Amino acid sequence: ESWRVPTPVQELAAGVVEPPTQFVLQEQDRPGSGTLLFATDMPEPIPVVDLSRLAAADEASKLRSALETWGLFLVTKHGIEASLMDDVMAASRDFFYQPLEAKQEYSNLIGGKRFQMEGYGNDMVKSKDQILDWQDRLQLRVEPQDERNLAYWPKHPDSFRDLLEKYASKTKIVRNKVLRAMGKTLELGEDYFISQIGDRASAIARFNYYPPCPRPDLVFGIKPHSDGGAVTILLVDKDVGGLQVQKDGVWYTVPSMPHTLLVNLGDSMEIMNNGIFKSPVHRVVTNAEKERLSLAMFYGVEGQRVLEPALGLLGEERPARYRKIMASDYIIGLRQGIAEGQRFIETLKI
Numbered sequence: 001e002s003w004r005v006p007t008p009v010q011e012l013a014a015g016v017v018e019p020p021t022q023f024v025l026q027e028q029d030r031p032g033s034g035t036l037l038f039a040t041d042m043p044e045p046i047p048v049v050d051l052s053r054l055a056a057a058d059e060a061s062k063l064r065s066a067l068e069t070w071g072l073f074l075v076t077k078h079g080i081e082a083s084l085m086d087d088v089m090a091a092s093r094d095f096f097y098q099p100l101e102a103k104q105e106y107s108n109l110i111g112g113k114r115f116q117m118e119g120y121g122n123d124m125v126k127s128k129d130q131i132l133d134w135q136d137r138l139q140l141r142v143e144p145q146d147e148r149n150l151a152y153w154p155k156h157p158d159s160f161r162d163l164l165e166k167y168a169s170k171t172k173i174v175r176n177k178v179l180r181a182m183g184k185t186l187e188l189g190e191d192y193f194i195s196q197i198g199d200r201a202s203a204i205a206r207f208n209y210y211p212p213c214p215r216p217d218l219v220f221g222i223k224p225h226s227d228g229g230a231v232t233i234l235l236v237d238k239d240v241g242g243l244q245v246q247k248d249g250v251w252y253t254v255p256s257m258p259h260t261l262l263v264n265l266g267d268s269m270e271i272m273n274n275g276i277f278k279s280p281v282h283r284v285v286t287n288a289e290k291e292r293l294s295l296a297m298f299y300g301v302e303g304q305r306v307l308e309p310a311l312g313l314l315g316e317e318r319p320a321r322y323r324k325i326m327a328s329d330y331i332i333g334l335r336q337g338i339a340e341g342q343r344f345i346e347t348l349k350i
């Protein structure tokens, strides 16, 4: 019924002093679990990789340690000009500041009623009792080019499409450089994960908009999750805080550095590399003072590729730790309802 069609949070958040009930977490699930302390500082050395020196042995070691410890790292000297990072996030902000009716010309609710992934709106509301996240998003298929539907790409500002195309071409370079270093450190060959991901590899842009929340202790901006694909390249406008990462059951603030990107692994990579590096669970907490904008570039595996532990990682004392599954089937499985506290990737573990 009506709960299947959410009104965007940017609208519902305007002027409120309490979060509407459908956003309120149970006390034990809250950031801070009922307190006002949401996460602990990340212990040093914080995971930071200089992409321009990634071929050097000491930089490769930093990448390996970051992926082993956290499953993510900040990247410096990554080749994306500050002006382009600023302009693509300005295009996003320009879009989200438009009136609701203008943005819903790109709505991800078909006919105003039926959820699909692509477009402006919210993640799927699967049940009336689902607690909703305090965010809206514009999600667009970027690659492969023949799978795009430009009808969902904002026409205003009119440079939106050009800026996203240019930015995505630069994050693809980051993807490649990271994947080649991961192939090298695992002794699989630099092209190993490039070839696994394949010609038809997916790239999806997700523009997240988190409105201010009067009670950041009661809600999530985006709930705890891991990304499903191979690797994600994340840009946070003006380095506004909110992103946190889980390790051994503890939540840590993901630090910021000016003019950096964040790289994290996804579940498909966790399978392909036999769990040597894992896909990190992460979340965003809101704040009371200001909106927060991010752009996630999700890089996936072509659908027909069987995800499996790389043969070069296996041996008499190195058992496979994950079952094989077609990438397209893994992504379908992620869409299915899951029991409270459970993770889909765990169902593939041996």
Ligand SMILES: O=C(O)CCC(=O)C(=O)O
Pocket (backbone or CB within 6 Å): 206, 208, 222, 227, 234, 236, 243, 282, 283, 284, 293, 294, 296
């Ligand atoms: O906004 C962020 O920093 C994280 C967004 C995220 O995790 C996602 O879109 O999957």
Ligand SMILES: [Co+2]
Pocket (backbone or CB within 6 Å): 225, 226, 227, 282, 296
């Ligand atoms: Co994510």
